[PDB]
């Protein structure tokens, strides 16, 4: 699908059997999601943006279905105000910016 940016580019994602909504965020290097449980080993890491930094748990090689498109990659879990799908996963589904 093509998506215009008049409204927030929100899409439905399915991860770990859960349904959620997330931003297609071209300004995000990595994918950050609200608090939730995921499988495997995770390591504590810290990410930052506008306003400061937060503490998240890094899960690697996590399967996600972003608007029906599958991708496996790193997923950070922590107190983010919004679920954002970063470039690490946007690349996997072949998303591009066009103007």
Q: Which does 96 bind (CB under 5 to 8 A by kind): a copy of itself, ligand 017, none?
A: a copy of itself
Question: Is 25 among the residues known to form the active site?
Answer: yes
Binder among 86, 89, 90, 95 for ligand 017 (CB under 6 A) = 86
Are 92 and 73 in contact by the 8 Å Cβ rule? The answer is yes
Helix, strand, or coil here: 82? coil
**Other Cβ atoms closer than 10 A to 80:** 18
CA–CA separation, 72 vs 63, rounded Å?
4
Question: Is position 30 an interface residue for ligand 017 (rule: CB under 6 A)?
Answer: yes
Q: Which does 19 bind (CB under 5 to 8 A by kind): ligand 017, a copy of itself, none?
A: none
Residue 59 vs 80, nearer CB to a copy of itself: 80
């Amino acid at each position: 699908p093509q998506i215009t940016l008049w409204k927030r580019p929100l899409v439905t994602i399915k991860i770990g059997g859960q349904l959620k909504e997330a931003l297609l965020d071209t300004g995000a290097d990595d994918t950050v999601l609200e608090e939730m449980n995921l499988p495997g080993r995770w390591k504590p890491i810290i990410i930052g943006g506008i306003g400061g930094f937060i503490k998240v748990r890094q899960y690697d090689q996590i399967l996600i279905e972003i608007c029906g498109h599958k991708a496996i990659g790193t997923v950070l879990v922590g107190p983010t105000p919004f679920n954002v799908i970063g470039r690490n996963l946007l690349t996997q589904i072949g998303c591009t910016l066009n103007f």
